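Support case: user asked for a sample of complex input and structure output to validate their parser. Sending the pair below.
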Amino acid sequence: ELPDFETRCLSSLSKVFADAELHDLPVNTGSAMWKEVFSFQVAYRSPQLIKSLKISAESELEPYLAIRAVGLSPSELPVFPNPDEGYIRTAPGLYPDPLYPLADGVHAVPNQWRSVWVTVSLPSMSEFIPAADIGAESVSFPIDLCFEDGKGNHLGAEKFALEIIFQELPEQTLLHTEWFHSDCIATQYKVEVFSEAHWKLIESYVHNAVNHGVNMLLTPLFTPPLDTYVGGERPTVQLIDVEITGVNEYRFKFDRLERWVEMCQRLGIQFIEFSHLFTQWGAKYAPKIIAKKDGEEKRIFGWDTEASGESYSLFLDQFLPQLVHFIRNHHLDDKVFFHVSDEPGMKHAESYRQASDILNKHLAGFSILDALSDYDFYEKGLVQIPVPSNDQIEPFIEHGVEPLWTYYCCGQDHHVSNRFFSLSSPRNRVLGAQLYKFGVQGFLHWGFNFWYSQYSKKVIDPFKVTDADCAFPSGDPFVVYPGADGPLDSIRWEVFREGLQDLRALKLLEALAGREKTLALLEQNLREELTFKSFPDDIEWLLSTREKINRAIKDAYRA
Ligand SMILES: [Br-]
């Protein structure tokens, strides 16, 4: 006689822990637009150990549907000291995060809730395979999920009803970069940088990025000078070929950059974000730069070459005009961004100025972006486009700074949206609504796939170490895991795309009904105005808000 077995259908916004009771309420309905990725999960529990469950879905949406297992990752540093009351947990342990192919095997483990995650990637209406009335406002499709043991006995089932609203979620216009660490791919898969095997993996990772709303890619002219200790290095990742012809004299080749840019174009990246040309913590030094003299490679710049020295000045006087010629020849003039150095403090205003001044002699007319969360520094007029943290953005909104950009990282641990393991899925997804309300033009994140320790002192295994060796709250350094042939998603990466989908849906309702009505619907029944710091951290609020937006779109009078 069969083991006992229970199921509960849930939204994408639950995190099901294997060591706790499940309080979440069942969710068996939702709505979506064409070209939207709609996700849900089913939790299940048995008192027995049941190995290699057979899980299947039956739906007209089967061509668009994937099922994955929600795996557990360790976190030794889930929180910084004194986590606010909105954290879902504070103790080290195992957290639901990675999403594994079902082919990898799925088990019921005694008296533990586990989950399977369902992704429905909807096409355009014109590509949809099932018959659907082109004149309907929406059509509902059942999705039935079935659990059986290894030997074909039925254990459980859940039915989900997805309503597809017959309008398209419009193309994303928000600029969105998640810094891509090519080096981390090379060291994890054990391939040489810019080998053909490395290029193939790069393509897989970029494809995943684009699919999750990344339209701007960090482009390593020289080894990005990021997360490296003073006097330290990361593996050489350098698209520019440099030949030393004599003292302070160079020649350049851009053929590997041209390969990179063509890859970007082909995979759907729209903007090229060139890597920083000076070090972190005040732009005092050059990046690591490698050059050939007489066939042989040597390091010509780095932590022993001051950024304000004439040597690095003369190098950029030769390089930058040649990069500008490349840009113009490839019709990239309005598609590029440059970086100086992030978050210069007031004590570094002078070194930042001297660095920024070098670029300004050559890069007139181009967008130059830098993380900058201090409005008093911004008033000095040294940074062109500031990228303030979402916990520091208030004075940039108050003063009408344009274009408005935001980021978050490990430092944004209080109140605001983030993507830590120990934070709820609503506190991730709500970013979409905040971006909408404040008219943000771009969002930046440092950690697509950062798989080293703090300061890149060692390589870590991201399946075992999720906090960069007790430096950053787990979830901060990476949203993808290394699968055998390409990325594995986290539930947090799926939920972040949902926030970008909410932004796109809000902008659609704005096109149909205007901004005043859209913003009023979004803030209906809130006790406090929506800000980057103040929102309901609540599954029911967010789901019912997006459902209202969808119904208002469905009901809108259309041209
Ligand atoms: Br958008």
